[PDB]
Design a protein around this ligand. Structure first.
Ligand SMILES: Nc1nc2c(ncn2[C@@H]2O[C@H](COP(=O)(O)OP(=O)(O)OP(=O)(O)O)[C@@H](O)[C@H]2O)c(=O)[nH]1
Ligand SMILES: Nc1ncnc2c1ncn2[C@@H]1O[C@H](COP(=O)(O)OP(=O)(O)CP(=O)(O)O)[C@@H](O)[C@H]1O
Ligand SMILES: Nc1nc2c(ncn2[C@@H]2O[C@H](COP(=O)(O)OP(=O)(O)O)[C@@H](O)[C@H]2O)c(=O)[nH]1
Ligand SMILES: COc1ccc2c(c1)NC(=O)CN2c1nc(Cl)nc2c1CCC2
Ligand SMILES: [Ca+2]
Ligand SMILES: [Mg+2]
Ligand SMILES: [Mg+2]
Ligand SMILES: [Mg+2]
Lengths: 437, 54, 327, 427
């Protein structure tokens, strides 16, 4: 067994971590006080769930997680929340004043104050690992802390843990729920500084999660609680192979090997189905073919884009529930004839399938209904570059007038790092278009 | 459709389906730029305190 | 009010669509780079489809179908017909076409050497026989069998091509404008030499004997239907228009899965220009499809009004000249 | 995240006393400092504006400054005067005589060190100080001259804190003396340099609202301050109350100020109400949105159609459909998109609070960084030059040590401010 440490940065990272670890405990049968009655190896073990949880002599199962926010009010709700007993106080780190939606304030000014304390608390969890394989980083592109401090942390993690893989769960900025106007700045700045330090990054456009909650959950004004519970389901599907018995994506290296042929192009698109409202009185349960066909509808993707006008480099299908290989190939046979699925010429056209028999778990009283079977598709399609084009266009509009730049320069940043970061993004869009045409 | 590498267990099973074959900066440099930006902050604050002194 | 932007000043069709929309009193035009639009009359090159459908509180619509260039490029059209089973290599209404780069040369000269046994005039896009001359002219182009026995209008012994305007709305309804046009050649068809191509190329700009038989070398459906009655004892509907409606429907229904915006976050419509070639036995051949077609002066007022009624006001309602091709 | 409140001068202490009256009622604090409310939403962020003293009392973190005892004695005698910490009353005796020089250079210099002592004492008790907010007028002497002297000295001692101001602009429609354009031009020069956010509260706009809209024939300063205290309560809602947006002064300045000198906001309020007269029909969300953007609800006499909105911040207060708020806010942006700069995407952010102000079931407060605010500074620069071209009344200032050159520099800097707002109105 090889352990994975999760790191949650900023408001979006911390609150999504709350959602995921709440879901993990329900799936593994762990209680808010850390007890796991099904675990018969008291005080230790090397099962698959021990990748994400350590064990104390009293039987407590402690997440291998560290929460860090430059401002305390979000983590304070964790310190007093329903899972207050789950975490040790040392893995919850807070400052006094936040980055104020300023990448340069989170990376340079306030980040330098706390970067050494975080790495020490991170070192405390790594010393409990018999064989660390890497980290899972949760953060937002738009936040000053989620963008600024994460990039500083990702730089240092490549130094102190040069042999470890690092995966990102990033919240792409959407104005419907965003509270900052300078989020395109923070997004480009943090993507440039983090690009060579992340092995695989799963982007989640809040616009896509918002409309999914409106369309498929009948929620008029979705809140972060609504969004984060749906996001945790996707994240749980992606990490389920690290926590459960299986042969597909068993370590973080296999995520890069299966999904990322080019180091820079490491942004797989995630599609998830079915999303069913718990208030739906009468529901006809969807079949394997129906939910596999839904993986190629843009309305079910974490980033709204058109994969028909790009090219795939890899494709995973992660099933949960009553699914057998026979029904999957029958579904893939039908879908290949009716949809535009073009792979790059240097890649085989095919799918890697992983099936977990335990159906998806839902929190009691949540918005999601229990389903018999579900699927998360991880596809590395060049169509996701549409999100970079949108983001870079908003960057180009503001930066042409140098609007809000003084806030970043006033923190010690240099105006050149803007154009330097934008140049790297212009190269990233260029790489996608080469592979995709 | 070729179904390969089928592994099974109690939790579930996995396999692969093929439809067609093919056709870092050091800690020194990090501390250096973190301090170069603090120097640019200290300089801008000094020019402010010098301006307020006049 | 609804809002729209204009990003192709060179468009004669949508220049009139701008005037019609503004004269409604319910459409306000914004500046090119204003993102808060309902409708985009976008550019012909590098249209930013990735930025459409991401403005909250705005149903966005664009006058182009992303991916439709596969049908509107001569190289892409040939590849689409050879490879798609819905059209098949044995497509009866498309002339034999091969793609050659400055390629399928080996597969091309295979058929040109079977022509030696026999008609072996080809066109590349120009017109030549034997074909060894044509390859060196190319040095991407597509070579195609030149139809040596075309239907010739009388009086005049003239060549022509038929242009049909097709509108595909946001629901992928296929609308065929009832008014077409024959872009005729004012020179008598001479099959002795193809170096002189004023009687072969039926392009309007190539004609500049012009203007003799009808105004602007444009014979519309009213007159051409009467000619077929008097001369050949048939109608335009039976002898030509059924094949035209079959070709238009086959081409668009083939690419529907790859361009349809039924469940997308933005919507698309597009006006197409299908160019047909009628031969000696009243058989229609598809020459090419045009992605940004221009209309005829007589028909601008009626067609552009229909584009607003069918493609724009259907999505943005206010306060038939088309034949729907069913599928 | 504590905020230190300062009120300087006659105007600064009268609108400041009303502000503390209004928000103390909203937070359920009585004149004696005892909390007798019903909701726990009130006290969750009560520390932003209040210190907790002995016996569970709430002392406003407010400092009262004046070069006269007249107005400040009326405050201590007022309805809420006993809530203010008595040590925070700092006052002289001579007064400033509506003279910016007396407040900034002579009379105010004697007293400013005493104020900074009280400022320092409140700041040392702060867990994490966001910054300061000053209420004052720009037309008098104390709030205008000494107010800007405090801001200059506060920035010297707390250079990494936010400086926020509520600055009342003078108007001949509501005029005390003829030298008001002199004091205002000298003060705006200071505000352009030493503040992060300034709410331009134009007395001309307050008069026109009282006269044209509320149908008050002879408006008093009390009728003007009702609009100020309603606006001040609205703009500070997201600072005082918990919600989806728990905001501070720095995030406000970061997202509202694209260029440091252009930080003068147009406040707006809806529905416009007069004192002692309650209207009984609640406004629909479309009506709140329609009025808060109307020029007749702007607290700065500027035509927003003559400029473009750089950034906009909107607050809705009451029980209403957040979906209907989102639709209406998107409806204004998409219907009048030419008035929002295209080079700042999504420059309108809206927040909703469940607690409505006293006497209203639904309200809407508007904060606008519009290039049309140049009309306010153009108006003052015209009144300034009309006197300065003849050096009229300048002896009141040169007698306090000032040189004509300082007036020339202040006139020039404000004219640069106007031309800078003009730069981004054409772009
Ligand atoms: N999906 C999701 N997005 C969130 C959540 N919280 C914040 N965001 C998004 O994150 C962006 C702002 O970043 P935050 O995480 O709130 O800021 P931060 O990382 O704490 O950094 P600072 O507050 O600026 O110091 C906005 O675009 C929000 O839409 C959340 O709980 N779930
Ligand atoms: N296979 C063929 N057989 C006979 N004639 C042909 C032919 N291909 C083209 N032509 C003639 O050549 C003319 C020009 O050909 P083509 O349509 O490819 O050029 P073009 O793209 O400039 C016209 P447009 O773009 O306006 O539709 C046609 O109008 C037709 O008269
Ligand atoms: N809105 C409003 N304006 C005031 C009030 N009192 C004075 N003013 C304005 O302030 C200016 C006079 O400044 P004042 O504050 O009285 O002098 P100071 O004591 O030296 O600060 C004039 O332009 C008045 O119109 C008030 O209560 N409300
Ligand atoms: C132009 O885009 C903006 C504008 C303002 C803000 C933000 C973004 N985001 C913030 O966090 C602070 N902020 C606010 N602040 C305060 Cl006191 N009240 C409010 C807002 C938003 C509306 C009410
Ligand atoms: Ca165990
Ligand atoms: Mg935060
Ligand atoms: Mg053409
Ligand atoms: Mg006075």
């Amino acid at each position: 067994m090889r352990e994975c440490i999760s790191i949650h940065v900023g408001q979006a990272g911390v609150q999504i971590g709350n959602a995921c670890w709440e879901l993990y405990c329900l799936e593994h049968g762990i209680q808010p006080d850390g007890q796991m009655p099904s675990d018969k190896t008291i005080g230790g073990g090397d099962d698959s769930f021990n990748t994400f949880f350590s064990e104390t002599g009293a039987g407590k199962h402690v997440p291998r997680a560290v929460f860090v926010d430059l401002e305390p009010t979000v983590i304070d709700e964790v310190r007093t929340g329903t899972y207050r007993q789950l975490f040790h106080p040392e893995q919850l780190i807070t400052g006094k004043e936040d980055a104020a939606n300023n990448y340069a304030r989170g990376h340079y000014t306030i980040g330098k104050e706390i970067i050494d304390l975080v790495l020490d608390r991170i070192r405390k969890l790594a010393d409990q690992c018999t064989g660390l394989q890497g980290f899972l980083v949760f953060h937002s592109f738009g936040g000053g802390t989620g963008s600024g401090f994460t990039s500083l942390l990702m730089e240092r993690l490549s130094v102190d843990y040069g042999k470890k893989s690092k995966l990102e769960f990033s919240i792409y900025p959407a104005p419907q729920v965003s509270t900052a106007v300078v989020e395109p700045y923070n997004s480009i700045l943090t993507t440039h500084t983090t690009l060579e330090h992340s092995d695989c990054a799963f982007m989640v456009d809040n616009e896509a999660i918002y409309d999914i909650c409106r369309r498929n959950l009948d929620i008029e004004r979705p809140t972060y609680t609504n969004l984060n519970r749906l996001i945790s389901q996707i994240v749980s599907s992606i990490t389920a192979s690290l926590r459960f018995d299986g042969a597909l994506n068993v370590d973080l290296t296999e995520f890069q090997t299966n999904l990322v042929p080019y180091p820079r192009i490491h942004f797989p698109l995630a599609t998830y189905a079915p999303v069913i409202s718990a208030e739906k009185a009468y529901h006809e349960q969807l079949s394997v073919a129906e939910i596999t066909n839904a993986c190629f509808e843009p309305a079910n993707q974490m980033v709204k884009c058109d994969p028909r006008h790009g090219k795939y480099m890899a494709c995973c299908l992660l099933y949960r529930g009553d699914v057998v290989p026979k029904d999957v190939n029958a579904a893939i046979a039908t879908i290949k004839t009716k949809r535009s699925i073009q792979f790059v010429d240097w890649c085989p056209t095919g799918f890697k399938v992983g099936i977990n028999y335990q159906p998806p778990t839902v929190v009691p009283g949540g918005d999601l209904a229990k389903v018999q079977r579900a699927v998360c598709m991880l596809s590395n399609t060049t169509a996701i570059a549409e999100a970079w084009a949108r983001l870079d266009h908003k960057f180009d509009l503001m930066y042409a007038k140098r609007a809000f730049v003084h806030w970043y320069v006033g923190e010690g940043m240099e105006e050149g790092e803007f154009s330097e970061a934008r140049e790297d993004m212009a190269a990233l869009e260029k790489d996608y278009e080469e592979v995709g045409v | 459709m070729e179904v390969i590498e089928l592994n099974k267990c109690t939790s579930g099973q996995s396999f692969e389906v093929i439809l067609k074959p093919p056709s870092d900066p050091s800690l020194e440099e990090i501390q250096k730029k973190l301090e170069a930006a603090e120097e640019r902050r200290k300089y801008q604050e000094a020019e402010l305190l010098k301006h307020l002194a006049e | 009010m609804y809002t729209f932007v204009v990003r192709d000043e060179n468009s004669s069709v949508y220049a009139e669509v701008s005037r019609l929309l503004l004269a409604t009193g319910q459409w306000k035009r914004l500046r090119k780079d204003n993102p808060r639009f309902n409708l985009m009359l976008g550019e012909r090159n590098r249209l930013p489809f990735g930025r459409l459908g991401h403005e909250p509180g705005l149903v966005q619509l664009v006058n182009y179908y992303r991916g439709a260039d596969k049908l509107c490029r001569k190289a892409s059209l040939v590849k689409l017909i050879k490879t798609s089973p819905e059209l098949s290599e044995s497509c009866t209404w498309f002339p034999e076409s091969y793609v050659i780069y400055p390629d399928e040369r080996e597969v091309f000269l295979a058929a040109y050497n079977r022509r030696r046994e026999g008609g072996n005039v080809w066109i590349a896009k120009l017109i030549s026989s034997e074909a060894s001359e044509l390859l060196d002219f190319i040095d991407v182009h597509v070579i195609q069998k030149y139809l040596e026995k075309p239907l010739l209008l009388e009086p005049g012994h003239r060549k022509f091509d038929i242009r049909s305007w097709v509108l595909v709305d946001h629901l992928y309804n296929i609308y065929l404008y009832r008014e077409g046009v024959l872009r005729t050649s004012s020179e008598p068809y001479n099959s002795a030499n193809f170096q002189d191509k004023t009687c072969h190329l039926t392009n309007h700009c190539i004609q500049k004997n012009y203007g003799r038989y009808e105004e602007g070398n444009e014979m519309f459906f009213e007159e051409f239907n009467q000619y077929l009655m008097d001369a050949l004892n048939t109608t335009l509907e039976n002898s030509i228009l059924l094949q035209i409606k079959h070709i238009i429907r086959s081409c668009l229904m083939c690419i529907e899965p790859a361009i349809s915006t039924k469940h997308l976050h933005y919507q698309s419509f597009q006006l197409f220009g299908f160019d047909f070639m009628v031969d000696e036995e009243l058989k229609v051949w598809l020459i090419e499809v045009n992605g940004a077609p221009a209309c005829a002066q007589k028909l601008y007022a009626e067609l552009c009004q229909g584009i607003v009624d069918v493609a724009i006001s259907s999505v943005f309602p206010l306060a038939s000249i088309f034949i729907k091709l069913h599928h | 995240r504590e905020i230190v409140h300062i009120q300087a001068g006659q105007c600064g202490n009268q609108i400041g006393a009303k502000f503390w009256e209004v928000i103390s009622d909203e937070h359920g604090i009585d004149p004696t400092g005892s909390y007798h409310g019903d909701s726990d939403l009130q006290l969750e962020r009560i520390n932003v504006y209040y210190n907790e003293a002995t016996g569970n009392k709430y002392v406003p973190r407010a400092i009262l400054v004046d070069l006269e005892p007249g107005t400040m004695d009326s405050v201590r005698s007022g309805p809420f005067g006993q809530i203010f910490r008595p040590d925070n009353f700092v006052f002289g005796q001579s007064g400033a005589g509506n003279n910016w020089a007396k407040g900034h250079y002579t009379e105010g210099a004697e007293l400013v060190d005493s104020v900074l002592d009280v400022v320092r004492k409140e700041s040392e008790s702060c867990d994490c100080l966001q910054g300061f907010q000053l209420t004052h007028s720009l037309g008098g002497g104390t709030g205008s001259g000494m107010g800007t002297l405090l801001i200059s000295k506060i920035r010297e001692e707390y250079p990494d804190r936010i400086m926020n101001t509520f600055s009342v602009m003078p108007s001949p429609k509501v005029s005390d003396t003829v030298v008001e354009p002199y004091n205002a031009t000298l003060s705006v020069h200071q505000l352009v340099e030493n503040t992060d956010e300034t709410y331009c509260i134009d007395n001309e706009a307050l008069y026109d609202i009282c006269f044209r809209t509320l149908k008050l024939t002879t408006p008093t300063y009390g009728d003007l301050n009702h609009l100020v205290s309603a606006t001040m309560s609205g703009v500070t809602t997201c600072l005082r109350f918990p919600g989806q947006l728990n905001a501070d002064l720095r995030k406000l300045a970061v997202n509202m100020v694209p260029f440091p000198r252009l930080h003068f906001f147009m406040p707006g309020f809806a529905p416009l109400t007069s004192r002692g007269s309650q209207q009984y029909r609640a406004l629909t969300v479309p009506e709140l949105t329609q009025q808060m953007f109307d020029s007749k609800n702007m607290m700065a006499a500027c035509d927003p159609r003559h400029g473009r909105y750089l950034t906009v911040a909107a607050i809705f207060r009451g029980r209403m459909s957040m979906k209907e708020v989102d639709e209406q806010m998107l409806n204004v942006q998409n219907k009048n998109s030419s008035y929002f700069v295209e080079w700042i995407p999504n420059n309108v952010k809206t927040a909703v609070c469940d607690i409505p102000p006293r006497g209203l079931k639904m309200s809407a407060t508007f904060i606008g960084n519009s290039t049309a605010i140049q009309e306010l500074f153009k108006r003052i620069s015209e009144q300034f030059t009309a006197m300065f071209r003849r050096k009229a009344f300048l002896h009141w200032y040169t007698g306090e040590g000032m040189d004509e050159m300082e007036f020339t520099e202040a006139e020039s800097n404000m004219n640069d401010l106007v031309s800078e707002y003009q730069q981004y109105q054409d772009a």
